[PDB]
């Protein structure tokens, strides 16, 4: 009757929560955290210093949105965190109220973006070992968890370790290949554009292309993206002229409800049905620094690894992540990759003649469930493995060596 | 002929030109090419610009240009780009030379496909119609600037590294090896790391931006363990540089590990063995009478070897190899072993010196070059070797 | 040497995986040349000798003179820089060092084995070279069984099956009492 460990997938967006050895993440709540801050002016020599017990006088989760007298302040920003005191407060609140798990008799696994600096991991591990006194800890990249969860798509019994994952995120979407359990360290790239700035662009365009909404209830209006309201588009200008020609049937309407005066307000739906999701393959719209597509990045990263691994990698691309829920995404990526790889093969064959014909490279995109969350099941299987109880860093290791035990990274080595 | 000869090294990163019998190059310009581009982010046209521009002007006006590199690792990618660069350097404002009555010296990298040499010689003979040309190996162009008839060259530069040991003058082709490491790669890596720090960078012009930062701040270490402990125990090694736009960035730890890829190619996905280890293996694989002479005389050629501290790391590594793989830790017999790395002050440009000195005495006699006449015949090429 | 020359052609291979790839390429598309100069001249007319190989990634590599260049290193060790002689010269020297009478028998019987001697035409080239070096008054025969790869294993199995060899083995008792030096005196 051994107690199960605890599985947590922290991040910038909706933080997944639940226990190991289970088939559904029970709690999925935002990162919004309340605080009894107000208007002091001395805010850089006493940030808060709440007198008495007012320090803990703050809510958390979905209940924290509807508190109109505090401040909703997200602690995370695309992985990197400025102030981690809010993170500690959120962690204690969750573990006690929601999870109800005693740290001294439980094992915690945490997930961080691959670009997280060593200092943040070291100091969060130190904080955990000092305050929570967790017997064991383990941090790993989320790509492998997604790969493990991808087995459920079809033929679980057929072991398939090779592949590559392009995961989404509220502020980051990364690319990580797997070569029979061992990933490549140098063949990893970080994409800054993600599923948040897209909504920023949507609302920015909407605030001028339409009127009839209140400033407060903007994001709820901007969340038409999460609805059926965005389809990807093999061509841009074609659909532009399609809308500018008819502009009658392709236009949709919004019927949101105000959260203050309970007065209905409506606005039409325009070019944003596709432009947002199209920004992924044209990031230049939002971020001027990163004028680089995604599919070509995928082929480049897959072309910077040994020959024997290039072939199977193209065959296994996993559709996991919230921002990847957009329809026809896989078709576009598959078609683009096939076109570029076929062109490269033809160029290679042109220089050296021959009547032969190489077997065409096969690129296939797999669509399945688990797309919204592919890290939780990986953590559950992580906990269920007995070897996890042995690999996890121990207390005595942190006792005198320090929190450096958690500094191991997949893209470092001397 | 005109008794006029110009020596050039159309390498990968930088291109140097000059006349024979010259102590230092007259003109030094890099290999930068880029069509005009307008960035909606910031900045607009201020001064004149042309559709195709190269040379030093790019180093100053890359802000509004799509800078691209034509050559890397000494191999041909874009025939037209190299043709444009050759036209520019041969124009009346860079060299101002008469093609029909001039001779040139070329220094192609060792261990490269013959197609590049054939294409370049054919282009020179047809498009520009030079009376005669020559191709030389870096070994002579280096050892001939100080009077050395024996040694091992560790020439490193943009592209790939190379080695060409020579004993008593006669060549030893079967003891040369190539590795996929160079300055460009050390650059890609300063970049993955400052990205971690949290800065977003492109691959168009900032690639040239990081060049100065690597030149000033980047340095190599003596012992990895001590330097790493110092970095993690102290923050005095932190330094910055003023960007052209006035932005300020902090780099204290990434400035040290980038050169370490030279001795640890594992960091950049290469199954290398290390420059020092490779040198030791190459020396050992030779005969015996030549090992001591090779060790006694050794040169550190190339601009990419100007990193501060490389000689110390190399000599220490070589001594460690000698101790562990020969004497099995017997330090007492190790004392008498001696090494003297040859590091001329003019390590930024030595090939040009060798070419100038060669042309000084190899100009009067016409039986040295591939004269224009032989080109018109078939069953040709591989005239000399 | 094959890797080095493949570099001169335009194809680069450094790591061990490409070492295995080049090993397979040599195993599949290499042969010996009866005459080196004639083969080089025919290569100058490169329209019937080049062959193509399919890499795992799908890239196609065209190999010409390299097919008959690397095997020639056996007969011309100077290519790698080794100051030695070829297999023909070494065999001639070894046979000459023997007694005069047994030279005839040694010439009449020349067994070859190993995985490096499967190149087609190797036997003919060796025969021609030996006959040219040896006096042209007797007959030299080369025997090339088609199962020379496992000849050593077959011989070991046959020797073990021999009844007389059941007593020549070395057991634990005698080894422990005597020591490791026993094997040195056991049939040299």
């Amino acid at each position: 009757g051994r107690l199960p460990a605890c599985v947590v997938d922290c991040g910038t967006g909706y933080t997944k929560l639940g226990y190991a050895g289970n088939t559904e993440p029970q709690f999925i709540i935002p990162s919004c955290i309340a605080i009894k801050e107000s208007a002091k002016v001395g805010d850089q020599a006493q940030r808060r210093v709440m007198k008495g017990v007012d320090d803990l006088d703050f809510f958390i989760g979905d209940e924290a949105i509807e508190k109109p007298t505090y401040a909703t302040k997200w602690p995370i920003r695309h992985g990197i965190v400025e102030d981690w005191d809010l993170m500690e407060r959120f962690m204690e609140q969750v573990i006690f109220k929601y999870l109800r798990a005693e740290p001294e008799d439980h094992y915690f696994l945490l997930t961080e973006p691959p670009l997280n600096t060593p200092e943040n991991r070291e100091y969060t591990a130190e904080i955990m070992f000092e305050s929570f006194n967790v017997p064991g800890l383990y941090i790993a990249v989320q790509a492998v968890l997604a790969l493990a969860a991808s087995w459920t798509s079809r033929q679980v019994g057929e072991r398939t370790l090779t592949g590559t994952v392009i995961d989404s995120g509220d502020g980051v979407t990364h690319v990580i290949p797997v070569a029979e359990g061992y990933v490549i360290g140098s063949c990893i790239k970080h994409i800054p554009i993600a599923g948040r700035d897209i909504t920023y662009f949507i609302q920015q365009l909407l605030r001028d292309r339409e009127v009839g909404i209140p400033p407060e209830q903007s994001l709820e209006t901007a969340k038409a993206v999460k609805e059926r309201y965005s389809y990807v588009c093999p061509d841009l200008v074609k659909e532009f002229n399609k809308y500018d020609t008819d502009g009658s049937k392709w236009i949709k309407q919004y019927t949101g409800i105000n959260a203050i005066s309970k007065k209905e307000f409506s606005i039409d739906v325009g070019y944003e049905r596709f432009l947002g999701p199209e920004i992924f393959f044209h990031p230049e719209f939002a971020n001027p620094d990163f004028t680089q597509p995604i599919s070509e990045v995928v082929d480049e990263v897959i072309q910077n690894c040994p020959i024997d691994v290039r072939r199977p990698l193209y065959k296994n691309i996993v559709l996991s992540g919230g921002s990847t829920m957009f329809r026809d995404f896989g078709r576009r990526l598959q078609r683009d990759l096939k076109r570029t790889v076929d062109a490269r093969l033809k160029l290679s064959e042109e220089l050296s003649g021959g009547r032969l014909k190489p077997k065409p490279i096969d690129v296939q995109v797999i669509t399945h469930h688990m797309q919204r969350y592919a890290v939780w099941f990986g953590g559950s299987m992580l906990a269920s493995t007995p070897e996890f109880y042995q690999v996890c860093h121990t207390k005595k290791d942190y006792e005198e060596i320090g929190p450096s035990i958690c500094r191991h990274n997949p893209v470092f080595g001397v | 002929q005109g008794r006029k000869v110009v020596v050039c090294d159309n390498g990968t990163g930088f291109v140097k030109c000059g006349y024979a019998g010259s102590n230092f190059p007259e003109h030094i310009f890099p290999a930068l090419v880029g069509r005009p581009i307008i960035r909606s982010t910031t900045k607009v046209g201020n001064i004149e610009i042309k559709d195709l521009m190269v040379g030093d002007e790019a180093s100053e006006l890359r802000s509004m240009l799509e800078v691209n590199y034509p050559m890397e690792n000494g191999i041909v990618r874009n025939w037209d780009d190299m043709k444009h660069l050759w036209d520019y350097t041969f124009g009346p404002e860079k060299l101002n030379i008469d093609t029909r009555n001039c001779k040139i010296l070329l220094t192609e990298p060792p261990m490269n496909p013959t197609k590049n040499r054939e294409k370049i010689v054919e282009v020179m003979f047809e498009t520009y119609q030079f009376s005669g040309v020559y191709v030389a190996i870096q070994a002579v162009l280096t050892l001939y600037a100080q009077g050395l008839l024996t040694g091992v060259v560790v020439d490193s530069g943009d592209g790939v590294t190379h080695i060409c040991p020579v004993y008593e003058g006669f060549s030893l082709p079967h003891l040369t090896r190539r590795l996929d490491i160079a300055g460009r790669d050390i650059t890609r890596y300063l970049i993955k790391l400052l990205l971690l720090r949290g800065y977003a960078f492109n691959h168009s012009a900032d690639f040239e931006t990081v060049r100065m930062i690597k030149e000033k701040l980047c340095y190599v270490g003596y012992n990895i363990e001590q330097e790493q402990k110092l970095a993690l125990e102290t923050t005095v090694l932190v330094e910055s540089y003023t960007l052209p736009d006035g932005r300020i960035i902090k780099v204290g730890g990434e400035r040290f590990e980038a050169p370490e890829a030279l001795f640890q190619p594992h960091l950049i996905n290469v199954e290398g063995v290390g420059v020092a280890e490779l040198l030791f293996n190459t020396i050992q694989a030779a005969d015996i009478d030549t090992r001591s002479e090779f060790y006694k005389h050794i040169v550190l050629s190339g601009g990419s070897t100007m990193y501060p501290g490389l000689p110390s790391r190399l000599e220490r590594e070589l001594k460690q190899l000698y101790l562990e793989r020969v004497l099995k830790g017997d330090v007492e017999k190790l004392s008498k072993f001696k090494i003297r790395i040859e590091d001329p002050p003019r390590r930024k440009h030595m090939v040009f010196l060798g070419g100038a000195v060669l042309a000084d005495i190899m100009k009067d006699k016409d039986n040295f070059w591939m004269t224009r006449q032989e080109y018109q015949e078939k069953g040709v090429r591989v005239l000399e070797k | 040497y094959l890797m080095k020359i493949l570099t001169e052609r335009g194809y680069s291979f450094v790591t061990t995986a490409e070492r295995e790839i080049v090993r397979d390429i040599k195993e599949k598309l290499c042969y010996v040349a009866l005459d080196f100069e004639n083969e080089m001249a025919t290569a100058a007319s490169s329209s019937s000798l080049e062959k193509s190989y399919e890499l795992p990634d799908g890239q196609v590599i065209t190999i010409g003179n390299e097919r008959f260049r690397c095997p020639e290193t056996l007969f011309q060790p100077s290519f790698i820089g080794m100051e030695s002689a070829g297999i023909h010269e070494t065999t001639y020297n070894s046979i000459m060092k023997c007694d005069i009478d047994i030279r005839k028998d040694l010439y009449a019987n020349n067994v070859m084995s190993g995985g490096t001697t499967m190149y087609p035409g190797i036997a003919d080239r060796m025969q021609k070279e030996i006959t040219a070096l040896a006096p042209s008054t007797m007959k030299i025969k080369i025997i090339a069984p088609p199962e020379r790869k496992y000849s050593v294993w077959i011989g070991g199995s046959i020797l073990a099956s021999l009844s007389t060899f059941q007593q020549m083995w070395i057991t634990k008792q005698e080894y422990d009492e005597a020591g490791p030096s026993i094997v040195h005196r056991k049939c040299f």
């Binding site: 290679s348 | 690792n73 191999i75 496909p113 | 335009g10 680069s12 890239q59």
Partner: peptide, 7 residues
Amino acid sequence: WXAXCPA
């Protein structure tokens, strides 16, 4: 390069 590495 043509095969192996880019150049």
